[PDB]
Amino acid sequence: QNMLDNQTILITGGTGSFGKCFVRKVLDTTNAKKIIVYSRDELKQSEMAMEFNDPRMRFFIGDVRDLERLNYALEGVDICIHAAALKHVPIAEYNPLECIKTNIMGASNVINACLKNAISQVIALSTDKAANPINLYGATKLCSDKLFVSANNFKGSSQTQFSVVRYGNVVGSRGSVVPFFKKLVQNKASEIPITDIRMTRFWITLDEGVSFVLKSLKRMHGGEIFVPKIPSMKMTDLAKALAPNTPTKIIGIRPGEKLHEVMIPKDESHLALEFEDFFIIQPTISFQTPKDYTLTKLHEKGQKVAPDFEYSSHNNNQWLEPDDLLKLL
Amino acid sequence: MLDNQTILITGGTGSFGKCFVRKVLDTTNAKKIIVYSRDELKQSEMAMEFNDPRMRFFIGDVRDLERLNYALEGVDICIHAAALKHVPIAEYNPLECIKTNIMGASNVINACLKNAISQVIALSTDKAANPINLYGATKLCSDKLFVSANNFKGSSQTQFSVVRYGNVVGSRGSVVPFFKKLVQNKASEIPITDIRMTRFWITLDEGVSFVLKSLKRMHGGEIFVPKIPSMKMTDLAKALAPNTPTKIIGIRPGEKLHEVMIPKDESHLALEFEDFFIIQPTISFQTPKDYTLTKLHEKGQKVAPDFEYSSHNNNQWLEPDDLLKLL
Amino acid sequence: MLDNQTILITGGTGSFGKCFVRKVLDTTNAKKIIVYSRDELKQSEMAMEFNDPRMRFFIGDVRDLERLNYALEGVDICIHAAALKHVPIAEYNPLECIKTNIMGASNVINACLKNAISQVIALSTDKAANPINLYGATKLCSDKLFVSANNFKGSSQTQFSVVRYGNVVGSRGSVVPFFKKLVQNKASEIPITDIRMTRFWITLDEGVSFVLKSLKRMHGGEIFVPKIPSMKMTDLAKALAPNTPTKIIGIRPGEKLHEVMIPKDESHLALEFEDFFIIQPTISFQTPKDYTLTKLHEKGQKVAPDFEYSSHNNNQWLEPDDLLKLL
Amino acid sequence: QNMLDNQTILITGGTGSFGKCFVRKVLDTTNAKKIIVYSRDELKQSEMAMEFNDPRMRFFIGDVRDLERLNYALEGVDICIHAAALKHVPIAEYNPLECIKTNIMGASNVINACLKNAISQVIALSTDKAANPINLYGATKLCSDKLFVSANNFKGSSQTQFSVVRYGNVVGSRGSVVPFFKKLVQNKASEIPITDIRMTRFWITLDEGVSFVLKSLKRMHGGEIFVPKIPSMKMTDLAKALAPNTPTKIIGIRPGEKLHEVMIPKDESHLALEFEDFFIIQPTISFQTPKDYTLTKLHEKGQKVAPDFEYSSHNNNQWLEPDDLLKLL
Amino acid sequence: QNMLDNQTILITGGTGSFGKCFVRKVLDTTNAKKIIVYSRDELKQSEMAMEFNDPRMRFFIGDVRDLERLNYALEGVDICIHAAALKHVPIAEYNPLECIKTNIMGASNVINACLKNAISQVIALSTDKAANPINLYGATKLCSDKLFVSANNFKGSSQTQFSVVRYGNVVGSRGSVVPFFKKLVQNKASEIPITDIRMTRFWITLDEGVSFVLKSLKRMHGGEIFVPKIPSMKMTDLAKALAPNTPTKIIGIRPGEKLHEVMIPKDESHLALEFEDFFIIQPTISFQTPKDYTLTKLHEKGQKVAPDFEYSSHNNNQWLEPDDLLKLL
Amino acid sequence: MLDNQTILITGGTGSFGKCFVRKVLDTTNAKKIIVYSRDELKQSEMAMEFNDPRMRFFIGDVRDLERLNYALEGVDICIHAAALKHVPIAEYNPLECIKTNIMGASNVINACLKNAISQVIALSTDKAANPINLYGATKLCSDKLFVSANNFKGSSQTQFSVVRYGNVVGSRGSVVPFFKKLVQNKASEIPITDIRMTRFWITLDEGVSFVLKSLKRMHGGEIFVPKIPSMKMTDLAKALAPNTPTKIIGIRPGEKLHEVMIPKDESHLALEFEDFFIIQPTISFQTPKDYTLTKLHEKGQKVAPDFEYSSHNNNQWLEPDDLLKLL
Numbered sequence A, D, E: 001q002n003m004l005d006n007q008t009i010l011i012t013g014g015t016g017s018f019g020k021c022f023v024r025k026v027l028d029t030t031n032a033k034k035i036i037v038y039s040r041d042e043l044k045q046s047e048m049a050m051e052f053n054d055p056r057m058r059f060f061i062g063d064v065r066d067l068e069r070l071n072y073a074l075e076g077v078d079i080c081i082h083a084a085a086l087k088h089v090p091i092a093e094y095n096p097l098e099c100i101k102t103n104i105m106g107a108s109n110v111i112n113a114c115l116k117n118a119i120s121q122v123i124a125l126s127t128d129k130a131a132n133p134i135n136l137y138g139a140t141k142l143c144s145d146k147l148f149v150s151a152n153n154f155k156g157s158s159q160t161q162f163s164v165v166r167y168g169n170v171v172g173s174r175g176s177v178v179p180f181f182k183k184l185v186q187n188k189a190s191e192i193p194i195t196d197i198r199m200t201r202f203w204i205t206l207d208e209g210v211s212f213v214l215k216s217l218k219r220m221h222g223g224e225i226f227v228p229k230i231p232s233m234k235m236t237d238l239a240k241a242l243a244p245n246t247p248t249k250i251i252g253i254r255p256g257e258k259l260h261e262v263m264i265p266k267d268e269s270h271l272a273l274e275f276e277d278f279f280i281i282q283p284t285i286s287f288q289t290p291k292d293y294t295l296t297k298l299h300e301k302g303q304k305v306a307p308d309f310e311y312s313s314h315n316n317n318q319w320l321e322p323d324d325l326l327k328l329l
Numbered sequence B, C, F: 001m002l003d004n005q006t007i008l009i010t011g012g013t014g015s016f017g018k019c020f021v022r023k024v025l026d027t028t029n030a031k032k033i034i035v036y037s038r039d040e041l042k043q044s045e046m047a048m049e050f051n052d053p054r055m056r057f058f059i060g061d062v063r064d065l066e067r068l069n070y071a072l073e074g075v076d077i078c079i080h081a082a083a084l085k086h087v088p089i090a091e092y093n094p095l096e097c098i099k100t101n102i103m104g105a106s107n108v109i110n111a112c113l114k115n116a117i118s119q120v121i122a123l124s125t126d127k128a129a130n131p132i133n134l135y136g137a138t139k140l141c142s143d144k145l146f147v148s149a150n151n152f153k154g155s156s157q158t159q160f161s162v163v164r165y166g167n168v169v170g171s172r173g174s175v176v177p178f179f180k181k182l183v184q185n186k187a188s189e190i191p192i193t194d195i196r197m198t199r200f201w202i203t204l205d206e207g208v209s210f211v212l213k214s215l216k217r218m219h220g221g222e223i224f225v226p227k228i229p230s231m232k233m234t235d236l237a238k239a240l241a242p243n244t245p246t247k248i249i250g251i252r253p254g255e256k257l258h259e260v261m262i263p264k265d266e267s268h269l270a271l272e273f274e275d276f277f278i279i280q281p282t283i284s285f286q287t288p289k290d291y292t293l294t295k296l297h298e299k300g301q302k303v304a305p306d307f308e309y310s311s312h313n314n315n316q317w318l319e320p321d322d323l324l325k326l327l
């Protein structure tokens, strides 16, 4: 109970959606000694510092592309949550090397810095877009995930543990559908923009993911890809609940966009382990000091899966009717 | 076409490289063919076996931007075949694969723009479509960089394209070859990872050929995919081993049962031709291109909504006897 | 002037950037306006609010020389407004401010010379005159690099100048704005660091305007300083808060009571004009320039020996009522 | 008494004016175990090695712009005196990036290397030109000073202490006024070069600064800017003492040159602390482990100053008539 | 006896001639805990892994030009054998910077990484071509040798020992004379290619050098250049034994090629120490913690040499008639 | 020749540098002479002693590729004399010597090709022939890089050559000078490392002269070696000290008894001329050159099979009296 007290925590990209929520959640429910925000923008950092005004907060201006900076930033840290990233899919397609340096090289430097300072546990934030990806963004994340899982071999001094938490779309996420679908029904417009008519997506909220990351910390062994069992949803209904009775047009599919987001690839189901509310995709490689992922640090037992499993926002065992959506801003 | 043209090929000492060089020397009027790779052993041996004035050997690494800037001086066409492709080794040495495949792509691109190369073609892999293993992910990033490189318009308009296809028959240290050592060593059985395991098949010479056709029709920005046949590994074993039992083992670190060539989610960007496909860019260039009409004036048509080129839902297959014919 | 010209502005998503872009789109025939900054969030939002074909968004960092070399290809004019300007945060993250403000200046300069840009203007600050805080020191180094860059004469003669002025009224997260939240939140008092605290005032639009005039008259090597009015913070509080007491607090980490625009020690290098000043270079270029006569044929005269443009010994002031008028 | 015995000392730019004098002063008056000279030029190093021929001397060829080199050079060092620099003001104006890489980046690498090797104390040499500067040289030094003072936060392992010692013009300093004013009155020339007629400067000697640095070591807490109370002087008299009865011309003010050098800025007087023979400008930032700069390591008590103080070679409470000057070569 | 058990060994360029042989020799005759192969090519690594299939083998894909990679690769290593190199003389002449980055910079990074991880002993492979060299290859190796010998000064934490083993031509070495002279007499060709008629070379076999390296490990103090007393041979006879009765032509001298390879330079004989079967060329510099190279770690006593000595494949006290050659493939 | 030409010399503040600059200013119509070195002290002093408009001083390090790219803009000829030459100090600081001598060579070369310099001459040393000490080894690598640089043929054909010769009489801090302090300080004896110690001798002015002739005759790829006399150190001591005993000490860290100029193993690549030698490249360039005929139409002949230019088997010697004449 409370396996995070007196710990110093560093979170890259702490000024973002997840970052701000996660930090709030840690200051409010744990006796963590210190929380360090690591990000580049001075504007967002000065405002987040006023927004929080907490003595246990520390802010480091820095780029994850900068190995030397991370080395100093992680000095004394026990836990690192890595959320820094360039996630705008269509912008990543026009600015590929940018997305690559931040997400892939960024992951490398963070891993490097965490080993040098002997951090204890590291959780990297992945995305559903990183499974059987088609867009660059998702490919960088897949590479990112691979680096973090692979980092569990290096048994130098202390044994830093690296795990990955993968989930998708976050409701109302700044710049997402909800925010725009809230400016449509609102600012009179008799036509709701729609890409496809079969378009669906996994949906989870900021707080759910945050809470999920914390629980993942409490049970990780290191090497896991944690996937939460979340409900699917068709964009048609997100345009009915968040849009009473208004017509809809069609602008076709956007760049490197899927119709359905995979969560647990059919090609890797033989590695997945089911649990009551989450999954564990085991390493596709073998470590020197292997672990049994069937028994979390929280004794939660895991079951294997059908050799033809494919967790997708398409064949999910649960959905969310319109009215449910409205039950959240 | 290539007469009086200087061509540089990274990874020139590899399986594709040697076949490509051999084919260029014999069928074009290329003035100079440059091999750019790291091994002095392979290059001296490739120099002895290719004793031709048209060759020139450069020792260099694609991870070295300065070296490439220098090697690409005066080059008209660049074929990028340098890579780390061993999937398992890539899972264990992930950063090495990333440095070579992704940063290497970026450097090659940089050096080509600076030296004002006319055309560039990077070799992709079917493992880059909806990838699940690291190697494939790095190639997908590579392909993306190359397609994206076409938004530059400084000195001369450098064109970048990608040629994607799967496993090459007999390929230096692959299934078929080392499999023959099996049915040749009296082996009481043949190793088979799975029964429903299928794969696309193309010969080393066909790929080289396809790369050369792609050069003749490219506008810059395409991912050329050749129409090739699939094949169940069930029959590949019962080809090199007509009479031998199979040791149904398991799946390797990052293998898939079926390799994708053109994803369903990208189908809409596809265009069918008689012999191949073109997956259109996902981005809009400062200057539009009409990929429905090649430089060879070939017309291509869109594909059905939920189309997909997989090694399992393919209509062209290669049975036992059909194999031998190659090697 | 700017018709059919390509303009690139670093830090294009900032307060100055957006105003400058808006002003360029509306008043010139610029063919293409390029925003170069790091945040995808701000750029996508700035793209939605500026839905114009003349725009182009590049994700990049000024600390990245390779990225700039690429972004500046084909650019005619470069406005450098990228920076880390939060003084306190600069005192705590000194190396970050140095990397962005100084190394960033050096890279921008390098990329401009290589791409043969015609004119470049970097935004300085009054905190760079006789500086006492790190941020200001980095800008002074920046300004020096830019002025010095004019000794190059390779391909095309690239001109580098500097535009220096102080605090911008209402500026995203500054005194005035957040101060209104005060007199708006019934606050029983207004935070005042000191009583004799004065500062120069200029509007976001005036600065943008001044930058554009500077482009029209620059020879390359000047530090253009606009004639703007000072203002006691005593009256700024008694403007947004006609009836509210002041919480006379203390001085922030690296604040000064009065900001200098033109130092006394540099007075001799100054030249007065009707609307502004030009602080002449401190070095002699391979090719002399006569800064007493702009490209707009405006004549400027020297100033008195021990002259000095301070926010305290200024003859132009902005009283309470005078403020509101802006925001 | 003698809080420097058995210590290994490294001094960057040890082949310079201060360097050579400081090294002499340390070999002669302390039982320091070893003194390492860190600089680039082989000529000056081979000659300094013959000039000293001391077994406790070590010479490392290296550039302060080279982080890897410093890392190895500082291995085993207890104290680092940082005197390497590009100080020629007019040359720094024509070669700005050069001055920036050596003085600013140089300071960074030295700080980095000192932390990695867990040095105990570090003293950086500043200049009066770094206060309310106008020339690039002075701006780089101001940046340099800022980095060294800011380095006292990092409480990793050991607590390396970083302080700055700032003073100005050194009499007869190679290439200074004295050396030229000694070639004038000498090599017949009926005209002494003069910039301004109100020109003044703070004056101190090599030995005084050196001794001042050593004493600063004995009392520093880390984070201080030590300023010695030194006498001012008008260039007119330096042209009378060092020049009997000879006329004088005027070549105006040189590049980025001041008429008067500030030592303690009016804008920062509220941070200064007076002592019997020196001042302490406290950090403009707050550290995690704050110190009371009113009581040196040598118990010397400090007094605050008038909120309108401005220590300048203009309003100094002491000057140096011609005859005094002659009392020194 | 067996001063190598339970040790973790890393060998750069382990996929080469020496590498493969050395690894075989270590797995077969020592209780070394682990052997790490460090090299770039995935092809040669996957095949060497099948060729050995030993659990005590580890393979790291990496470049010696990459300092960060070596740092991680040497983590936990006790002994490093450095055999990675670009040795093709004529290719090094056309690709000089390539040879320089691999051999010289490569040596530096390996030394750097070995110090950071506190390895115990390091042996670098040199060549006879590095003594009084004329070709670039040999010059890089000379530089390489110099770095490794010079690395014995740094007395940071543990005292890593660096020695160099220098010998020349290896019989039948892939791509050497034997392999081609085996394709001549073989594949009918009435003319054997010959450069000069006085051409001679030192000859040793793969196994001899390997064994020599291991024994060098057992007796090194650190700082030595070990040279084995090996037999000379004239290329004329290598063309009689490996070529019964066939004529011979002359293609003159190839690029940067010598007629005779020096082993122990006349200019350095005063540093050499003779032993029953090997020599020791002492450091041309003095270390802080000097050693007596006259008494190996194996008590083997060494004798000085004549101040006019010149060990060359020209004045050797032993040769190898044709028939002897045939006694080896 | 050099009229209206811009010349840049690295290590321009050194013994060779100053003499070379002085000689260029006085005997050519060079439009601009650029000194590129690191010390501000030496450069300001060299500026005061050389108060000439034709000079220009750049502070820079040869280890800095970016700095060189900039300094070499607009340069026609480059003389590379920057180096770390103190043999003992090189043995103790091996990586520093390597960075300056080898990487420095590579950067100078890179910057020259990019800025399209016409001719480049790097100063080598006799310690680079069959070297035994680190300094010499680094120079041999340097020479190799320079000779090899001639295989480039991008924009303009840049020519790279090498000038090699030994110890310079009186040289700032060498044998002769500091030796005079001896016979001047009444010293009861003179330090002599060995009795059979010989060395080549050339004056500072002769070397400079030889470099200028080399520029006039070079094709690019040569190592010019001047015919200079040897000298026993036995007589050099009995010159500055007619009446003084010798303290027969020992050999320094990396000394040789006799310095080689042209190795026996390279003899075959040599060519004799009236006043000098040319050691031909060891590699074949994309475009052959006939080094038997200079640009000054001088004819050179091969040398005897086992020829070798050593300071011991030389036929030209400098006796006691012969020395004084210089210094």
Ligand SMILES: NC(=O)c1ccc[n+]([C@@H]2O[C@H](COP(=O)([O-])OP(=O)(O)OC[C@H]3O[C@@H](n4cnc5c(N)ncnc54)[C@H](OP(=O)(O)O)[C@@H]3O)[C@@H](O)[C@H]2O)c1
Pocket (backbone or CB within 6 Å): B039, B041, E012, E013, E014, E015, E016, E017, E018, E019, E038, E039, E040, E041, E042, E044, E045, E062, E063, E064, E065, E082, E083, E084, E085, E086, E087, E102, E106, E125, E126, E127, E128, E141, E167, E168, E169, E170, E173, E174
């Ligand atoms: N050749 C002789 O007869 C001989 C005689 C005496 C001494 N030696 C010395 O002994 C050493 C080994 O010689 P060898 O005969 O075993 O030659 P080899 O068969 O060419 O082995 C060299 C190995 O080094 C690896 N390598 C090359 N560049 C590398 C780099 N940049 N980073 C990491 N690994 C690299 C190569 O593996 P990858 O291609 O997979 O990178 C190659 O397998 C050499 O240093 C040589 O100087 C050789």
